[PDB]
Amino acid sequence: IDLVTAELGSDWPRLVAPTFDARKAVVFDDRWASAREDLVKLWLAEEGDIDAQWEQLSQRFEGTGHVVATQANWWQGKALAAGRNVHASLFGRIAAGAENPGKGRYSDEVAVVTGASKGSIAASVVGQLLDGGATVIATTSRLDDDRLAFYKQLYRDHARFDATLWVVPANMASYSDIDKLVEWVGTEQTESLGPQSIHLKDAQTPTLLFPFAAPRVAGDMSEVGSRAEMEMKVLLWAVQRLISGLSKIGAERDIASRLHVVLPGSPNRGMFGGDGAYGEAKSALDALE
Amino acid sequence: VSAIAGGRPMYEKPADRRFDHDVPEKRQEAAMLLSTDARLGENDQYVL
Amino acid sequence: EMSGAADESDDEAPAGTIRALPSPPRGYNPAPAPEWDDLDVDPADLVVIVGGAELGPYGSSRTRFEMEVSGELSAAGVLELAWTTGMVKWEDDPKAGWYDTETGELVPECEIVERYHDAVVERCGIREFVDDGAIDPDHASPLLV
Amino acid sequence: AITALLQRYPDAETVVLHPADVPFFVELCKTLGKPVNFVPVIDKDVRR
Amino acid sequence: EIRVPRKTKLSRTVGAQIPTGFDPTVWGISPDMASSIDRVALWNIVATVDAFLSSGFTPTELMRWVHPSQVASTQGTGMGGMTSMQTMYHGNLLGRAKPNDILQEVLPNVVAAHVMQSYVGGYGAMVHPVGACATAAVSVEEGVDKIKLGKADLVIAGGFDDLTLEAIIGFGDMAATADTEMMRAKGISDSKFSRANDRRRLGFLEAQGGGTILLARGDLALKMGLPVLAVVGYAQSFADGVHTSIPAPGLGALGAARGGRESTLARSLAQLGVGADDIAVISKHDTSTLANDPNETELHERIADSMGRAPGNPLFIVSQKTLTGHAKGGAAVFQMMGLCQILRDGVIPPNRSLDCVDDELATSGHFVWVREPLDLRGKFPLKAGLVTSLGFGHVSGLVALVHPEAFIAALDPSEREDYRTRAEQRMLAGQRRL
Amino acid sequence: SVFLDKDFTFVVSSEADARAFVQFDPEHTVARPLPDSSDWEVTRKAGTEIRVPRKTKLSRTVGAQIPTGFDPTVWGISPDMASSIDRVALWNIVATVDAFLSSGFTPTELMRWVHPSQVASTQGTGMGGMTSMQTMYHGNLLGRAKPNDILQEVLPNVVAAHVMQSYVGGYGAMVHPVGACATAAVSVEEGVD
Numbered sequence A: 001i002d003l004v005t006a007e008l009g010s011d012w013p014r015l016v017a018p019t020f021d022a023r024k025a026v027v028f029d030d031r032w033a034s035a036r037e038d039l040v041k042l043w044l045a046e047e048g049d050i051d052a053q054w055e056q057l058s059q060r061f062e063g064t065g066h067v068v069a070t071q072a073n074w075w076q077g078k079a080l081a082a083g084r085n086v087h088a089s090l091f092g093r094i095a096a097g098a099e100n101p102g103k104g105r106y107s108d109e110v111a112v113v114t115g116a117s118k119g120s121i122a123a124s125v126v127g128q129l130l131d132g133g134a135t136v137i138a139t140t141s142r143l144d145d146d147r148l149a150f151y152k153q154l155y156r157d158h159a160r161f162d163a164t165l166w167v168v169p170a171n172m173a174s175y176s177d178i179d180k181l182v183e184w185v186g187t188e189q190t191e192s193l194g195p196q197s198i199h200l201k202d203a204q205t206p207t208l209l210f211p212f213a214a215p216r217v218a219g220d221m222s223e224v225g226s227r228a229e230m231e232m233k234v235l236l237w238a239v240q241r242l243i244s245g246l247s248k249i250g251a252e253r254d255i256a257s258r259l260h261v262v263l264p265g266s267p268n269r270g271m272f273g274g275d276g277a278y279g280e281a282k283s284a285l286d287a288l289e
Numbered sequence B: 001v002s003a004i005a006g007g008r009p010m011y012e013k014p015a016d017r018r019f020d021h022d023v024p025e026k027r028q029e030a031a032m033l034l035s036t037d038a039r040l041g042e043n044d045q046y047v048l
Numbered sequence C: 001e002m003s004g005a006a007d008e009s010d011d012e013a014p015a016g017t018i019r020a021l022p023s024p025p026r027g028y029n030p031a032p033a034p035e036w037d038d039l040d041v042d043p044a045d046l047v048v049i050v051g052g053a054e055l056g057p058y059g060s061s062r063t064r065f066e067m068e069v070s071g072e073l074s075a076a077g078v079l080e081l082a083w084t085t086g087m088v089k090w091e092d093d094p095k096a097g098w099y100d101t102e103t104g105e106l107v108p109e110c111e112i113v114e115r116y117h118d119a120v121v122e123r124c125g126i127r128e129f130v131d132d133g134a135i136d137p138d139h140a141s142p143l144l145v
Numbered sequence D: 001a002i003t004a005l006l007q008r009y010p011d012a013e014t015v016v017l018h019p020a021d022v023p024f025f026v027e028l029c030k031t032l033g034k035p036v037n038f039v040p041v042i043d044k045d046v047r048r
Numbered sequence E: 001e002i003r004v005p006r007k008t009k010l011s012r013t014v015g016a017q018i019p020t021g022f023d024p025t026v027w028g029i030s031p032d033m034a035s036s037i038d039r040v041a042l043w044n045i046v047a048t049v050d051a052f053l054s055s056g057f058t059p060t061e062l063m064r065w066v067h068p069s070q071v072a073s074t075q076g077t078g079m080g081g082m083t084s085m086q087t088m089y090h091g092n093l094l095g096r097a098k099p100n101d102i103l104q105e106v107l108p109n110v111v112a113a114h115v116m117q118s119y120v121g122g123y124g125a126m127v128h129p130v131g132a133c134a135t136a137a138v139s140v141e142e143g144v145d146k147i148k149l150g151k152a153d154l155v156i157a158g159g160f161d162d163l164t165l166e167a168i169i170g171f172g173d174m175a176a177t178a179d180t181e182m183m184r185a186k187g188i189s190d191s192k193f194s195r196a197n198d199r200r201r202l203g204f205l206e207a208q209g210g211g212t213i214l215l216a217r218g219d220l221a222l223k224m225g226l227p228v229l230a231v232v233g234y235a236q237s238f239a240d241g242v243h244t245s246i247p248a249p250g251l252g253a254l255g256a257a258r259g260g261r262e263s264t265l266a267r268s269l270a271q272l273g274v275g276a277d278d279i280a281v282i283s284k285h286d287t288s289t290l291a292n293d294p295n296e297t298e299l300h301e302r303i304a305d306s307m308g309r310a311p312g313n314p315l316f317i318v319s320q321k322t323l324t325g326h327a328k329g330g331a332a333v334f335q336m337m338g339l340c341q342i343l344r345d346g347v348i349p350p351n352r353s354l355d356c357v358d359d360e361l362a363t364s365g366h367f368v369w370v371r372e373p374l375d376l377r378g379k380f381p382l383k384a385g386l387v388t389s390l391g392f393g394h395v396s397g398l399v400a401l402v403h404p405e406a407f408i409a410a411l412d413p414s415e416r417e418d419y420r421t422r423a424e425q426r427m428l429a430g431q432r433r434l
Numbered sequence F: 001s002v003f004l005d006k007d008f009t010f011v012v013s014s015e016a017d018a019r020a021f022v023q024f025d026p027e028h029t030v031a032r033p034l035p036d037s038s039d040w041e042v043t044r045k046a047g048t049e050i051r052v053p054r055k056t057k058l059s060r061t062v063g064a065q066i067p068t069g070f071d072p073t074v075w076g077i078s079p080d081m082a083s084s085i086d087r088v089a090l091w092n093i094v095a096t097v098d099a100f101l102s103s104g105f106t107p108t109e110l111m112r113w114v115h116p117s118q119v120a121s122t123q124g125t126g127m128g129g130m131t132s133m134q135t136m137y138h139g140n141l142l143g144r145a146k147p148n149d150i151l152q153e154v155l156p157n158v159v160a161a162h163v164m165q166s167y168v169g170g171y172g173a174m175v176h177p178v179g180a181c182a183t184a185a186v187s188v189e190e191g192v193d
Helices: A002-008 A011-015 A032-045 A054-061 A067-078 A085-102 A121-131 A145-158 A175-185 A227-252 A278-288 B002-006 B022-034 C002-007 C061-069 C075-084 C111-123 D002-008 D021-031 E031-036 E039-052 E059-065 E082-094 E110-120 E135-148 E165-174 E180-185 E218-224 E252-256 E264-270 E292-306 E331-345 E359-363 E412-433 F015-022 F079-084 F087-100 F107-113 F130-142 F158-168 F183-192
Strands: A026-028 A110-114 A135-140 A164-169 A190-193 A197-200 A208-211 C047-055 C088-091 C097-100 C126-128 C141-144 E005-008 E014-016 E071-077 E154-161 E209-217 E230-238 E279-283 E315-318 E367-369 E384-391 E395-402 F011-013 F029-033 F040-044
Touching: A002 A011, A026 A145, A032 A067, A032 A145, A032 E359, A032 E367, A054 A085, A067 A085, A110 A121, A121 A135, A121 A145, A121 A208, A135 A145, A145 A164, A175 A227, A208 A227, A227 A278, B022 E252, B022 E292, C047 C061, C047 E039, C047 E135, C047 E218, C047 E331, C061 C075, C061 E331, C075 C088, C075 C111, C141 F130, E005 F015, E031 E039, E039 E082, E039 E110, E039 E154, E039 E209, E059 E110, E059 E218, E071 E110, E071 E135, E082 E165, E082 F130, E110 E154, E135 E154, E135 E209, E135 E230, E135 E331, E135 E384, E135 E395, E154 E331, E165 F130, E209 E218, E209 E331, E230 E252, E230 E264, E230 E331, E252 E292, E252 E395, E264 E395, E279 E331, E292 E315, E292 E359, E292 E367, E292 E384, E331 E384, E331 E395, F011 F015, F015 F029, F015 F040, F079 F087, F087 F130, F087 F158, F107 F158
Parallel strands: A110 A135, A110 A208, A135 A164, E071 E154, E279 E315, E279 E384, E315 E367
Antiparallel strands: A026 A164, A190 A197, C047 E209, C047 E230, C088 C097, C126 E014, C141 E005, E154 E209, E230 E395, E384 E395, F011 F040, F029 F040
């Protein structure tokens, strides 16, 4: 064990420790609950007039509709009176939104997105996928409630009808995680109630795959200089095993459905010398094709 | 005097009136508590 | 240039001494329209709540309500909790003021939040069971066979 | 000056001097350069 | 036969406990009392003092307006005196020196008996409900009952319970308490493990404490010139019925909504000129157990449904057990306290422990679960709350609470203006005393 | 409670029970796996706390007791109930039955004239559930097998709760006074109320 450590270094064994376990998963399939609380917050806090584009944007977010959400909107609207100008604008807009809710349609997309965290490109992609009536698997490296609360905030805003979001602790650096995660992603979609509570692993065949997981350079353990070597596992090799993993599930459970993997290539290799990371690493994606 | 002699006076009830027909009575559970005048008929021997 | 801009700092003079305290609790009325008759209702037949209080994990009704509605204590919130938790003591010895009970140090009303509330939150509300009975149910509970 | 301060803090008009502000004032009377013109407190030192 | 010392490891590592460093001594309780009385007694004793402090101080001031036999004490317990009980059964079997007053101090009524001896000194009624978890609301019911019949014009209503060793092992054995080892496995911090109506709700967090309220005749409150915190429009306890099944929860609290316009719930409201739609807030028992939450929800959903609650005018519900935890005896009083504070301030407290609403609760459309505080300002009033609590063994209860300003409307403009004058003077004098 | 002056002779115990031993003493107790039997030896060193059995003679040799040979079974209470519930419960349960027998029998006949939520139960206790209480505080500290329903069965209100579950089945009020010695008359007061 001393010889093995001598070759690989100090940080590699410590960072390769397992993380994922099947019992920490959290599923948010409720729009119906979050849409009701979302409307009443608008109705009470209404200030800006009808000229707002936010009212049109929020109406598209309130486009999630069924017998449940209609019973909410159609009510607070019918309970609204002629008392003031805001009450005149709210009642009319709500009645129109209640009518548009009745005829509302939906789409469906099943996606798995990594590197979805706050203030990132993928986070803007995630909320937009949710805006497109999709089903999205969102992974987070930090499992802390501050990260957990963010995705709840992001979901309760951009979620439409038919939209289901899934947040999980995940580490793309761990092969065990990758195997365990997709073994969870590919199994059943079943919940067994016996004497106890057992949730059989939810099976959704991925349409889109977004490997936006992006390790950053933070060297507290002294790991500096060896990272570009390790990330080559993460950015490519572990992606390869991730692509291979979902390929097995698709073949074993026998789907002809093509998983669309968007490969986050770095822009225009060779014409920039200043990036230092992106430009060189992503040129082998042409070799991956 | 019928109770004292036979050991009759204590009968622990199966609660027949509660579950009497499995499907509707569970549905009728709400309707019972909601409306005032719903009660037991004696002729069926205390049916809900 | 930008690292340098971040690496080149400076100190704009800020002279500030802040304190925390408040007026006695007031009540904010609500706007309610009522069409009513006076003599109709018998006051002898009505039950009315004159007052109330509670002792619980969050302290009295004042501090508990602050934590429930707000989620953070006010000036009076931390001042009252630090008093109930016994962090602050009152001495008539010279310097005549509020003193920290643990270390025996004089305290003002401002630093109450800074010096205490961090520890107050931990040791109030819901936490691991502190053993005042010399017994821990979760760790070791005495058994005799 | 009085109006300027207590306009900024209108609550000063409706409330009590804080129980911890009472010892402070009595303390200031003792350290004052020229001895106070009045009697702030009736106590053991009242003769002084 | 020999009894040989051993040990055990248990599941519950966390409880909702009164802030560390609390002393009855700091509040001013004499050391002689602290010794002689159970820990539960220190809770009800200090609470009673602070309960009075809301209006008057000297308990004998009540004897100015009222003959002492018209002062009542209605104080509930689920168990009460727990420490003093466990002190005898250990101590006696262990021959350790223990107090001689033990059995007196284990009587769940002795705690407020201690308060009547030490403080009020009333010559009047003493009642001490056992409502399991529902004692608090059950106590209010009888406190209300004592006044209307002229037996007593001033009552103290409340409930209290303690958290000890063998209180924990009884619940954990009964399976009703949330298992901490499982909570940590799911990545749940101690503050986040009490979650009402949540999909993941694992069972209740046990707590300790006590609380009390002073209920009085409306005519007396004006005459004494004390603060009016709220009007109790109704109070009821309700049983359930015959069944074998252990998870099957009591639904009998629906009996208050029976009759529609003729129902006790609606008539209580109607006498103030208040409608069924005018109950904005229900305070649920919200035990965070899987049995109680959906049942209490179905219950509140149905009591609204038959009384003609306007479709989609949902009752906004708070869960205080997610914060304070569940104290058996003093459960519904903490909710009773919160409800008064809801009415006067207008603010509806959030459940901040709610990650996700249980998908089963979707079937209830007259119910809304709020994760973030909705704060009602001066332009956004509120009207009437409802406290509901479900105790063990078919103990269920309901307390309808209504805003104080509904009572001031019965005085006529001259006397209404005269009362506000007195109440204003009391608040200033009350702020002083406090 | 006595402090052991010199190390006690080792005794055989299970791994689960022996690890528990370590959680109390741990500087003062010593536990080891026995390689062959997988179980553990428990050795208490000097300084440990031991509780040693003794006896006491007391003043009260006489009480007023229900006539010898009384059984809730003879009255017709099922054995499952007798087990699961405190002795005090058997008293209020049979009394309630015989109380009804004064007029009507079937408790649901009340639901003919009355809506079930209008049936009330006001039942006082000075303590109540005493056996079930003393059963937990002994049993737990003694690790003896004791029932899981203990704290439910020690609630002075649970006794008539058991009666409402087993017999009347009313949907209405339940109150449970504590009057010390006066609960009975105190109960009547609230029943009247």
